[PDB]
Amino acid sequence: PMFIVNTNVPRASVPDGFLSELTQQLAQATGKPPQYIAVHVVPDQLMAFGGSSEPCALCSLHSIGKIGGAQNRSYSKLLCGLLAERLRISPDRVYINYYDMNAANVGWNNSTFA
Amino acid sequence: PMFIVNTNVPRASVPDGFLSELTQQLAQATGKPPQYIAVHVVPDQLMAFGGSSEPCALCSLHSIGKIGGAQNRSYSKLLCGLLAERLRISPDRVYINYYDMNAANVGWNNSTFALEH
Amino acid sequence: PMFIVNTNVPRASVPDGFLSELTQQLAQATGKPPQYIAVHVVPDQLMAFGGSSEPCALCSLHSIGKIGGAQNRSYSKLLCGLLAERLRISPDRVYINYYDMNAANVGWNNSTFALEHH
Ligand SMILES: *[C@@H](c1cccnc1)c1ccc2cccnc2c1O
Ligand SMILES: *[C@@H](c1cccnc1)c1ccc2cccnc2c1O
Numbered sequence: 001p002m003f004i005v006n007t008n009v010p011r012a013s014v015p016d017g018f019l020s021e022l023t024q025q026l027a028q029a030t031g032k033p034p035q036y037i038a039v040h041v042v043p044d045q046l047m048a049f050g051g052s053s054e055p056c057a058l059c060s061l062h063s064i065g066k067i068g069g070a071q072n073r074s075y076s077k078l079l080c081g082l083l084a085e086r087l088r089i090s091p092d093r094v095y096i097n098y099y100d101m102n103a104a105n106v107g108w109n110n111s112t113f114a
Numbered sequence: 115p116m117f118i119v120n121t122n123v124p125r126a127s128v129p130d131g132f133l134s135e136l137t138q139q140l141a142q143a144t145g146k147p148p149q150y151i152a153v154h155v156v157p158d159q160l161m162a163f164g165g166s167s168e169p170c171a172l173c174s175l176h177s178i179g180k181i182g183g184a185q186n187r188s189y190s191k192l193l194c195g196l197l198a199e200r201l202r203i204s205p206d207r208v209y210i211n212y213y214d215m216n217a218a219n220v221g222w223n224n225s226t227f228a229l230e231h
Numbered sequence: 232p233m234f235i236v237n238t239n240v241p242r243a244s245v246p247d248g249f250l251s252e253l254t255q256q257l258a259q260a261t262g263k264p265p266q267y268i269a270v271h272v273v274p275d276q277l278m279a280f281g282g283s284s285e286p287c288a289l290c291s292l293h294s295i296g297k298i299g300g301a302q303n304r305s306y307s308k309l310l311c312g313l314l315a316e317r318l319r320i321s322p323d324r325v326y327i328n329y330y331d332m333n334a335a336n337v338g339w340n341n342s343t344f345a346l347e348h349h
């Protein structure tokens with residue numbers, strides 16, 4: 001799994017430990033070992049949500065499996081919770097795109113996971 | 115809906131009003147209220163199109179529905195037009211990836227848009 | 232085809248001509264003319280891979296067709312090789328997401344690549 005967050009929140013507002021907390025919580029939530037987990041945080045972005053430039057975030061979670069109705073609702077509660085607590089972004093100004101990747105379509109270490 | 119534009123055009127060349135124009139024109143084009151529309155503009159990028167570093171853009175549009183043959187061609191005319199007028203990027207140096215998202219695969223406000231089951 | 236690389240490697244560590252090299256190599260690999268290849272490299276990113284901030288990369292390759300089991304394995308060897316040689320990123324700290332795009336879902340030049348039906 002890999003999680004990307006793009007936000008207009010300033011870099012200085014991203015707390016020490018944020019990437020590590022995302023890694024650990026995503027490990028817990030997806031059931032995948034933490035050595036698999038990639039996280040990517042992009043602050044200081046030029047963004048608007050609903051026409052407003054108040055804090056917001058556009059995110060993606062890719063995973064090989066473990067993507068679906070109830071699972072994605074659980075991920076959203078977890079991830080919105082973290083974005084609200086750590087970056088002070090309101091959950092209703094967050095979008096998260098979920099992608100169920102086929103193993104043949106994820107490259108790693110000179111090959112793929114197929 | 116969310117629209118992202120990544121471009122090698124400098125930040126200083128992005129005109130006042132650009133994010134708001136994108137928001138408004140996308141609301142009109144998709145027939146969805148502007149309150150739902152997210153836009154993201156990323157200037158000053160290291161990118162090439164056809165091996166040339168002349169102005170170009172790589173974009174994404176995500177929507178739950180309202181994605182398809184004729185609709186996507188209309189979005190391209192709209193969005194290429196705006197990128198040409200506002201950022202002076204040639205339409206033949208723009209790619210836009212269109213994504214028809216399933217409601218169960220879009221998170222928002224602690225949940226997703228799949229509330230039925 | 233479009234190839235995006237996001238990495239925590241410094242901008243200064245990206246060789247001049249890297250974009251051109253990626254363009255040429257991708258043209259050859261995909262069999263598409265270079266005029267249609269787009270490349271995008273994003274350095275200095277705040278990233279972790281397996282909980283570590285050692286050099287890593289998260290990438291995307293989009294193509295209309297020419298995506299598949301054997302082909303993707305070939306692309307991974309090629310692209311991991313270039314990232315290792317040019318950016319000094321270990322192949323086991325690279326992810327590449329492959330996307331087989333439908334022609335109707337790729338916009339270009341005021342339209343899309345679905346030109347056959349109305
Ligand atoms: C548009 C959208 C935003 C982010 C990712 N994919 C699509 C969007 C947002 C909210 C909606 C709510 C109800 C119905 N449709 C919606 C969209 O299409
Ligand atoms: C490659 C591409 C570019 C942007 C998004 N997805 C894929 C591409 C570009 C143009 C083409 C024209 C004809 C046939 N195939 C094409 C591609 O694969």
Ligand SMILES: *[C@H](c1cccnc1)c1ccc2cccnc2c1O
Nearest residue numbers: 001002036062063064101106113326
């Ligand atoms: C994490 C991942 C990263 C990028 C795209 N999709 C998923 C990941 C990595 C390796 C795996 C191997 C087997 C099964 N699942 C995996 C993941 O989810």
